[PDB]
From Swiss-Prot, chain C:
Post-translational modification Phosphoserine, affected residues: S24, S58
Keyword flag Acetylation: yes
One GO cellular component term: cerebellar granule cell to Purkinje cell synapse
Protein name: 14-3-3 protein eta
Pfam family for this entry, one: 14-3-3
Organism the protein comes from: Homo sapiens (Human)
GO terms of biological process kind: glucocorticoid catabolic process; intracellular protein transport; membrane depolarization during action potential; negative regulation of dendrite morphogenesis; nuclear receptor-mediated glucocorticoid signaling pathway; positive regulation of DNA-templated transcription; presynaptic modulation of chemical synaptic transmission; protein localization
């Protein structure tokens, strides 16, 4: 019972756009210490994407005000905006640790050597969430999360290159997000571009091994690689 | 500046 | 101040799309037992509009799934959907009661007799929020909220007709919502249309009394009256 | 079926 009860709940919360409920449910499914299917795995990923997405979107807006207020020399107001920006940060960080803990305690730990596709998926996700911490961290805390993200992405990419077709959505997605890590977090555009251009070219090369069943996903992500490339290179 | 959906 | 610290907070939450934080802050502001300006009062109303809107939106979606599932004869699944739909319903009701409690303990209680504008505002708000309960109530609980809603709307309307120009945004907004109350909650379309047509025609009559500073709000609400009217009357 | 914004 209990598992299907939570999976059912997760699906209703997705339809209801109640992503905090969706996340508590997939957290509880994961904590059962049994493996996830592709479908379950995507529910986990959707739930946390949307939770943390709302925090980052909020963080960004308040951060932006804080910088304008510092610039304006407004001391009394700045202390209030900063407090609120930091409250939103605490919520954001908690969402990311919670995920990363699940990746460490359950999801990555339980992958076989031969579960290349799961390993790639969860490592990309570890990379993503350390990257979300890196968007808001400073000082020596920043350097740690920056490193952990790169280590995760690098490991996932090694495996994807060896074990996945260049047109596989999880690979392209990983490429897209790693290239973002380099461009935004590492402030290293040259590196970000080759990586994105390599993955694009590589997908282009093998288009006649794409089954119709994923023409939607892989062209969608390829389009986003090219947008990032034209945006950055200018 | 999109990331993976 | 405590009070300006809270209004500051509210405005930041609005910009951050953090409406539950926006609501805590306007609740606290209200709970100071002093009157709200128009601006303050619009912050309260925006805050709770968005909170309760999200619950209603969710409730509609799950309720709709519940009905399809009942019709499909799926017993095991239905008990699960129903549980969630009920959990959402308790949240929604809690938001409505919190608002209503404020209107009663503080906002409406502290209106002078000559605060026609505020009385109309809060009484439309009491109508709105009992109407939200009525969207989800059943049985005898339904009848009580339906009545309280109509009583609040009716009282606001008598005042606005007497004390406000037909082009005034609050008055038009009130007319729009009370006409929805009749159409959807009372299943009384004939009543809902006269009221909507009355308020529209009445605003059309007195357009050269509209200061430019309000042309955007009043024409907007007028447009919405006409939509409702065309949509309803075909049927 | 819109109400007042």
């Amino acid at each position: 019972g209990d598992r299907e009860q939570l999976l059912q709940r997760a699906r209703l919360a997705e339809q209801a756009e109640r992503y905090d409920d969706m996340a508590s449910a997939m957290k509880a499914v994961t904590e059962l210490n049994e493996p996830l299917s592709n479908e379950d795995r995507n529910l986990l990923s959707v739930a946390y994407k949307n939770v943390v997405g709302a925090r980052r979107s909020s963080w960004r807006v308040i951060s932006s005000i804080e910088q304008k207020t510092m610039a304006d020399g407004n001391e009394k107001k700045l202390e209030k905006v900063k407090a609120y920006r930091e409250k939103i940060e605490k919520e954001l960080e908690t969402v990311c640790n919670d995920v990363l803990s699940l990746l460490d305690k359950f999801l990555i730990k339980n992958c076989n050597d031969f579960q290349y596709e799961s390993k790639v998926f969860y490592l990309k996700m570890k990379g993503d969430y350390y990257r979300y911490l890196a968007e808001v961290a400073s000082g020596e805390k920043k350097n740690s999360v920056v490193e952990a993200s790169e280590a995760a992405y690098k490991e996932a990419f090694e495996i994807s290159k060896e074990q996945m077709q260049p047109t596989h959505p999880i690979r392209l997605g990983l490429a897209l997000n790693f290239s973002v890590f380099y461009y935004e977090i590492q402030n290293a555009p040259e590196q970000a571009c080759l990586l994105a251009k390599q993955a694009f070219d590589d997908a282009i090369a093998e288009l006649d091994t794409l089954n119709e069943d994923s023409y939607k996903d892989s062209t969608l992500i390829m389009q986003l690689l090219r947008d990032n490339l034209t945006l950055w290179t200018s | 500046q999109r990331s993976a959906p």
